[PDB]
Structures are given as structure tokens and as C-alpha cells.
């Protein structure tokens, strides 16, 4: 019989200085932190596809009700929660004809098909940005489903459907968000099925993407993402101590260049003078030769840590007192030695390795519910387990579906207090602006770093990418 500690649930700050562990409840009662007067949404897609977007925006104007409100809070309407005008009136529409899609879509080569489809949308979006008077905060790309079916790797166009550049990714979404980076245009790619799904029909008659029970949560996740992409701050962390920078390093392969080249990208959060949080990516992608190195050479590690420390000093005035570098990979001494010259004497540099690989599964004795979320097993002063995914009473159910697995948090380098390290990762898991859920199973630095890397390893000609998450998620 071994000890199993519990960490207090992290709270996130809302309007009026009010705090709440949940995000849906926090917005439903107090609203967002900042006020956006309105969202001018530009829509690019078919005439048929604009109807579904108009219908769904009109839908989310009214309150939305799900079957079981205790697990998922009901959606009270966009203006009710965000105090922001998001009307179907004033949507700048760009015409993407079905014939134009069919000209490119019906191609045997996946790569050229993806490139042509993405070019079709991006050219119109750029022309609208440059050559029109209307101002668009966020550009919703309503995309069909056959394109989704046949514009991603390992998709085989049927031979009966065949009618008729490789330096880019074969995936539509990644390449799309990659090529728009030099223009800094916030976008939101929507499938037509993810929108008003009920008209999508299968053989048996039931809807394929049945969201009837989960209408409220779908509206919650769409509204929060749209509000974030328009420049709104839905919530903010309250438990973060002053003088701490975090950083999250994730290594992504690059196929276009010979050898995977192991691009490394980082997501950074620290605090600002005051109380505001500064959650921006810190990506200068530092490419790493060798097939499976996943480890940074001293020059590139020096560049990464320097750029991270300057992005802190130029925003606060002084150096961080303690950096807590999170990573999915285990550091060897080569990067740490290179890091230590860059860090001055005052700074305390800490490296943390987080993993899902460890097969530990805590089943409780009786009752068809899983372990409480927040439980942690501290193996020793340097390593620990944390059940970030599990049962939490407020949402009335487990965040997982089957029995989950904890996060193997190991302080690979530096000293750090293990309890304090586990006190921050649990707080990290609450800043997911791409989704309005109770909490995420992985710390947001390693997640948004993963996204910002999956976007920047799709384009060959990207130079000095933007550091805002608006352009990435």
C-alpha cells in the first residue's frame, strides 16, 4: 500500500476578477476578460456552403441545449456569454465555385491536388485582404467533405472518379495554415459536416457525426475558438507565480527536406508586468540533422534559449528567475551544458520530461468510475506520476473514456520541487483556447508547441513565422 497525494484544482481568472475551476461555467456566469465590440467574419466557400454557416451562426445566437447539462453546461448564446456581437449580417463572402473545386479535386496525384485546392482558397483570401475595403477579423473557410476525404495523405481517389509542389505537405489544413503565415490572417477551417450535420445522411439513416446530445459543447468549442481568433482573451491563469517562464519543446519530422531534419518548435508562457498572461509561441525553428536525434546541437540550443530569454526581458525588463522547460523527450547533457552559458547566474534552469508511455493504470476497488483527477504518485524527489485525465465531480464523469494513464513527469535536469512542478503542469492543462473543455490531458505548452510545429513543418519557404497562436490553432 503506497501513498497517493492530491493537488488542489487550478483556477482560471475571468471578468470582474472572479475565479472558477471550469471554463464553460466561468464564461457562462462572468464572461470573458476583454471586450470585443464585434467579430467581422469573412466566409470563403460555395454558395451552398455559406447557407450552412449562416444557419449555424443563427443557431448559436439562440441558447443551445444538450441532453445532460451537468456534464456539459448548456450554451447560453454567443452574445450572452462573450458580450460580443457575432451576427450573420456583415459576413464578407468569397465565391469558390464547385466547378473550380472539381477541376483540381479530380486529380490522381495527392500532392498536386492538395496544393491546387489550398491555392484556390488562399489566393482569394489574400486578394480580399489586400484589395478590399472591408475589414475581416477572422476568415472562416467552410470546406466540403469530399475534399477532406481526398486531400489528406493515404487517401486513394477511386479509379472511377479519376479525371486527370511536392515541397509541401499533402495535408490540406497544415499546408493552408502554413502558406498564410506571411500574411498574418486569422483563419478557422470548418468542415461542412462539423457545421449543421443533420443533412449528412448514411445508409442506416442515422446522422454520421451525431452531435444532437453534444450540441451545447459543440457551440462552446466553436464560440471560444472564434472569440480567441478574433483577438479576445476568454480566460487567464491565476496561480502562476511571478518570474517563471515555461517553454515547451516538441520535435517534429520534416519529410520535404532530405532526412527528417527534426525541426524543433517551442511554446512559451510567462507573466507580464501586472497580472496579464503572455502565452505566445517561441519558434525560430532550429533544424536538427540525423534521422532520430531529437536532440539540439549547442549552437541551436543556444539560439533557442537566447531567443526565449530576450522575449522575456524585452517584455518585463529583467531575466526570469526560474525557467521550467517541458519536453516530451529526455535531454542529454549536451543541450544542458550549452544552455547553462546562456542562462546567467541568477536564473535557475529546470528541465522536465513528460510522457504518456508508462503503463500504470489505477483501478478503484468498487464502482464503475475511475480515479479522481488530481491524484499523483510521487515516486521520489525527482520523479512522479500525475493523473491529469480522470474523474472530476463537477463534470460528473471521467475526462477519459476507458481507464486513462497518468503523465510521467520526471525532472530530468535542474533541481525543482516535484510538488511545485506538478502544481504548474496541472495549471498548464487549463489554457487550451482551441477547445472549451474542463481540462486537457497534456500541458498546453507541449500541445500548442505540437500544433505550431505541425504547421511550420509543412511549408518550405517560411521565414520568421508569427508568434501568435491566432494564426496556428
Amino acid at each position: 500500500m503506497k501513498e497517493l497525494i492530491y493537488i488542489e484544482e487550478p483556477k482560471i481568472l475571468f471578468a470582474h476578477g472572479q475565479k472558477c475551476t471550469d471554463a464553460r461555467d466561468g464564461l457562462a456566469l462572468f464572461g470573458p476578460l476583454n471586450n470585443l465590440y464585434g467579430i467581422k467574419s469573412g466566409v470563403i466557400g460555395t454558395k451552398q456552403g455559406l447557407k450552412i454557416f449562416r444557419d449555424y451562426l443563427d443557431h448559436i445566437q439562440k441558447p443551445i441545449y444538450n441532453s445532460n447539462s451537468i456534464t456539459r453546461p448548456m450554451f447560453p448564446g454567443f452574445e450572452a456569454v462573450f458580450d460580443c456581437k457575432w451576427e450573420s449580417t456583415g459576413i464578407t463572402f468569397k465565391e469558390v465555385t464547385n466547378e473550380d473545386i472539381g477541376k483540381f479535386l479530380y486529380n490522381s496525384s495527392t500532392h498536386k491536388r492538395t496544393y491546387d485546392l489550398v491555392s484556390l482558397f488562399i489566393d482569394k483570401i489574400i486578394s480580399a485582404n489586400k484589395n478590399e475595403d472591408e475589414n475581416v477579423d477572422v476568415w472562416f473557410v467552410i470546406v466540403p467533405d469530399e475534399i477532406y476525404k481526398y486531400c489528406r495523405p493515404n487517401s486513394v481517389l477511386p479509379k472511377e472518379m479519376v479525371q486527370t509542389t511536392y515541397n509541401y505537405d499533402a495535408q490540406f489544413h497544415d499546408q493552408f495554415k502554413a502558406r498564410l503565415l506571411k500574411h498574418t490572417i486569422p483563419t478557422q477551417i470548418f468542415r461542412e459536416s462539423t457545421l449543421a450535420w443533420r443533412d449528412f445522411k448514411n445508409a442506416f439513416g442515422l446522422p454520421i457525426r451525431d452531435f444532437s446530445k453534444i450540441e451545447g459543447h459543440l457551440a462552446w468549442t466553436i464560440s471560444t475558438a472564434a472569440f480567441y481568433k478574433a483577438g479576445g482573451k476568454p480566460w487567464k491563469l491565476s496561480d502562476v507565480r511571478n518570474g517563471v517562464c515555461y517553454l515547451g519543446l516538441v520535435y517534429k519530422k520534416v519529410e520535404k527536406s532530405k532526412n527528417p531534419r527534426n525541426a524543433c518548435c517551442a511554446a512559451q508562457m510567462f507573466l507580464d508586468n501586472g497580472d496579464g498572461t503572455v502565452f505566445k509561441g517561441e519558434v525560430g525553428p532550429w533544424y536538427n540533422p540525423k534521422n532520430g536525434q531529437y536532440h539540439l546541437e549547442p549552437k541551436e540550443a543556444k539560439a533557442l534559449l537566447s531567443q526565449s530569454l530576450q522575449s522575456y526581458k524585452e517584455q518585463i525588463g529583467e531575466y526570469p528567475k526560474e525557467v521550467f522547460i517541458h519536453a516530451k523527450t529526455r535531454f542529454n547533457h549536451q543541450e544542458w551544458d550549452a544552455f547553462l552559458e546562456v542562462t546567467p547566474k541568477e536564473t535557475n534552469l529546470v528541465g522536465v520530461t513528460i510522457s504518456k508511455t508508462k503503463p500504470l493504470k489505477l483501478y478503484k476497488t468498487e464502482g464503475d468510475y475511475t480515479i479522481l483527477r488530481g491524484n499523483a504518485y510521487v515516486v521520489n524527489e525527482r520523479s512522479a506520476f500525475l493523473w491529469t485525465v480522470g474523474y472530476v465531480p463537477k463534470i460528473q464523469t471521467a475526462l477519459s473514456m476507458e481507464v486513462p494513464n497518468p503523465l510521467f513527469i520526471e525532472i530530468n535536469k535542474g533541481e525543482a520541487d516535484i510538488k511545485q512542478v506538478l502544481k504548474d503542469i496541472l495549471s498548464l492543462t487549463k489554457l487550451n483556447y482551441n477547445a472549451c473543455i474542463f481540462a486537457d490531458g497534456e500541458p498546453v505548452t507541449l500541445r500548442f508547441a505540437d500544433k505550431i510545429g505541425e504547421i511550420l513543418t509543412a511549408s518550405t519557404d517560411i521565414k520568421t513565422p508569427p508568434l501568435a497562436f491566432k494564426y496556428y490553432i
Binding site: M1, L4, H16, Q18, A28, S69, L362, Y363, D368, L372
Partner: protein, 418 residues
């Protein structure tokens, strides 16, 4: 009838909180009067407020803050409310609300110091919960109105019913404790007696080829059947190590390092586990990285060991519970076990389509909850048992590794309830 909730407050300064509170109370079906949103334009405001407090005010809510203590209008409305409190004979008429942390309880206006206040300083949601509970207890009339929006809002505010409670709880893991190890890890230098082009994996007891030494916990002449050249081996050529020192990590030298000596123990333990599963006659499904062992149909009675079924029937697809294990020595000496489901169309032949197996596994696991996995896991492990407390791994003719069939139990100080 008096069915209004007057909210006196600082109207230029305390405007935002008062607006939010009034809106929330209206959304709950509570009729509310307040100057900022209910006072009519172009009217004698004092006469209207007089009428509201004297005649229609069911309950009086005084928003107390640093500004609200000593400015004239708030005091005037409070005095009128006190007169109405005397007239109605209702000691609970005035319910002051404190939203200012800086507002010390010593310097509050005496007329409301005597009264009890509802705490809004730390959170505006616990205060709302307290107000609602007091109003339900004190029986303030509410017109139900929406009856769905209002009820679900009441659920959303009362968020409070579900929190962590302090209570010790027992949890069962999937870590099968390794109870004992053989005394010595032996490196027999068979050298030329061991064929260089031979498969050490085919040896009965588990043995790893390291340099020219054979890594095994077994006896020197225990491999004579597969190696006839080793019959003339000399036992003085062994470099046996005190296994406990390897587990501690104390032993380290040029011959073997600590990292590379414990890595050889894990492979030995895994191979012994595999050989035991071969001994137990359980069929195996080859996975991508590990291998998992699933139990046939008809091998055990009713396909249900103890009181837990391990193989069931689903459409034309028989589902089988299977486990895969791996030894790890970093945290503890343990044998981690992971659960899996594999499907057979006839009960003897596995389905060759990986996609079909994945889909069927998802279909069967959509509804397998905590005790729907734990009970099967403990049933399978108990079925692998040789005695009442553990089962042994055949690693030597005289050396055995006893792994318990009772997983390491965990204990948390906090819990919850249905």
C-alpha cells in the same frame, strides 16, 4: 403583494456588480428592482423608490462597500428599509452584501454590523449560492417563468454540490509485485562450447549472450540438452554477482555497468514470462511492439474463471480478454500488465484484418468501465496463479522468480461519491 428584491448600492461605482447580480436574480425568476435598470426615466425617483420599498419590496439587499457605508442616498434607503422592517415584523428584511475585501468588519455601518452579511468578498458565486439558499429558506416568492433555463441555471450555480471530499480510498493497479529473485546472476564463459551462430532464445531457461559469457540466473550445466559441449564446463569460471547489489546499484566496474546489468535482468525476466506463458498453454496475438496472450474457447470451464467471464459472444465475433506484460526495475521491481481485447470468428482462429480487430475492440470497449476492466484483469492474473499468493517464473532448474498475483495497492486521502 410584495415580491420584489430591492438592491440598494453605489449606483455610479458599484454599478457593475449590482447589474450582474440583478441579471442573475432575474434569470432565476426572482423579481428585482434596481435604479440602474428598472428605474423609469423622467419620474420623481425618490417617490418611486419610496413606494417600492414601502409596498412592493419583499426583501432588501444592501450592497455594502467602501463607498456604500457613508454616502447619503444609500443611508436614506437603508433607513427606509429599517422602518419597513419594523412595520412588517421581519428580522430578516435587510440582508447586507459585502463585496469589498478592504471593508473591515470593524468600520462597517453599525445598522448593518448588527445584521449578518453574505460573503461576496472572495467569490461572487459562493455569495450567490448563499443568497439563493437564504432566499429558499426564508421563502421569498419566485415566479418560475422559464422553468428550464431557471432550473438549469440553479444547477449551474448550486458547481458547488460536487467537490473533492477528504476520505481515504484504496486503488488497485496493474503492477504485479516481484516477490523474490534468485541469489546470483551467473555469467558462464562457455566460449567455444557455445556455438557463435546459435539462437540463445531457444534455450529452455532464459539466457542472454554477453561478450563470451552467458547471462542467466540458471545453473551452469542447466543447458546441456541444447549445448552438449558445455557438459565439461568448470564452475570456477563463473563471475556470479550478488543480485541484491545489482538492484541497489552498488556493484559497478569495468566488466559490467549498473545500467547494462539491470537491462540484462529485464530481458531475462521478460523472456521467463514469455516461456511461462508458453508453459500455461495460452494463445498469443502478435501485436506491433509487444505480444499479448489470449485464452482459448473451451480451455477453461464456461469461459469464466472465478466469477468473471473472460471470453464472450458478440455478433459472429467472439471477443477474448488478453494481457501483455513487461518487467521494469526503475521505480520498483514490478511486472506491468496491460489489458487488450482480441476477436476470433471461430473461437480458435484470430481475425487477420487489423482494421476489423480495431473496430471490434472499440465496439466492445465503448461500455467497459473501471470495474469492467479491473475484474477481468484480476481474474486473468488469478488464472495464471500457481498458489494462493503468487506464481513463479521458471528461470532456473533450482532458481525461480515468484511474482505475486496481487497488484500493488495504492491509497489516496481524498475521494468522491455517486
Amino acid at each position: 403583494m410584495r415580491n420584489k428584491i430591492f438592491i440598494s448600492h453605489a449606483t455610479p461605482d458599484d454599478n457593475d456588480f449590482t447589474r450582474w447580480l440583478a441579471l442573475k436574480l432575474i434569470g432565476l425568476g426572482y423579481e428585482v428592482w434596481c435604479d440602474i435598470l428598472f428605474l423609469d426615466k423622467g419620474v420623481d425617483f425618490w417617490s418611486n423608490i419610496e413606494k417600492v420599498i414601502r409596498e412592493d419590496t419583499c426583501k432588501f439587499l444592501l450592497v455594502s462597500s467602501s463607498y456604500s457605508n457613508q454616502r447619503e442616498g444609500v443611508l436614506k434607503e437603508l433607513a427606509v428599509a429599517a422602518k419597513v422592517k419594523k412595520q412588517l415584523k421581519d428580522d430578516k428584511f435587510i440582508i447586507p452584501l459585502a463585496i469589498d475585501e478592504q471593508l473591515s468588519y470593524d468600520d462597517i455601518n453599525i445598522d448593518i454590523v448588527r445584521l449578518n452579511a453574505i460573503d461576496f468578498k472572495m467569490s461572487w458565486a459562493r455569495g450567490l449560492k448563499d443568497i439563493l439558499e437564504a432566499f429558499e429558506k426564508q421563502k421569498v416568492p419566485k415566479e418560475v417563468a422559464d422553468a428550464s433555463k431557471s432550473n438549469l441555471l440553479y444547477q449551474q450555480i448550486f458547481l458547488h454540490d460536487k467537490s473533492v471530499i477528504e476520505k481515504e480510498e484504496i486503488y488497485d493497479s496493474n503492477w504485479l509485485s516481484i516477490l523474490s529473485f534468485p541469489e546470483e546472476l551467473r555469467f558462464h564463459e562457455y566460449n567455444w562450447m557455445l556455438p557463435k551462430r546459435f539462437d540463445v532464445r531457444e534455450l529452455t531457461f532464459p539466457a542472454v549472450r554477453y561478450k563470451n559469457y552467458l547471462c542467466t540466473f540458471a545453473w551452469a550445466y542447466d543447458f546441456t540438452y541444447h549445448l552438449p559441449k558445455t557438459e565439461t564446463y568448470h564452475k570456477s569460471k563463473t563471475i556470479r554477482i550478488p543480485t541484491e547489489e545489482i538492484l541497489s546499484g552498488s556493484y559497478d566496474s569495468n566488466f559490467i555497468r549498473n545500467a547494462e546489468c539491470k537491462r540484462l535482468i529485464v530481458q531475462l525476466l521478460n523472456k521467463a514470462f514469455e516461456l511461462r506463458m508458453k508453459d500455461k498453454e495460452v494463445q498469443e496475438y502478435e501485436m506491433s511492439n509487444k505480444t499479448a496472450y489470449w485464452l482459448e474457447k473451451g480451455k477453461l470451464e464456461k469461459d469464466k474463471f472465478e466469477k468473471t467471464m473472460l471470453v464472450g459472444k458478440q455478433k459472429d465475433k467472439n471477443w477474448h480478454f488478453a494481457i501483455s506484460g513487461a518487467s521494469k526495475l526503475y521505480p520498483f521491481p514490478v511486472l506491468m500488465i496491460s489489458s487488450h481485447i482480441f476477436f476470433t470468428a471461430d473461437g480458435k482462429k484470430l481475425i487477420d484484418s487489423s482494421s476489423v480487430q480495431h473496430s471490434s475492440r472499440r465496439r466492445q470497449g465503448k461500455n467497459w468501465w473501471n470495474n469492467t476492466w479491473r475484474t477481468k484483469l484480476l481474474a486473468f492474473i488469478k488464472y495464471l496463479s500457481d498458489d494462493d499468493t503468487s506464481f513463479y517464473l521458471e528461470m532456473g532448474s533450482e532458481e525461480k522468480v515468484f511474482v505475486s498475483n496481487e497488484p500493488v495497492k495504492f491509497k489516496g486521502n481524498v475521494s468522491y461519491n455517486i
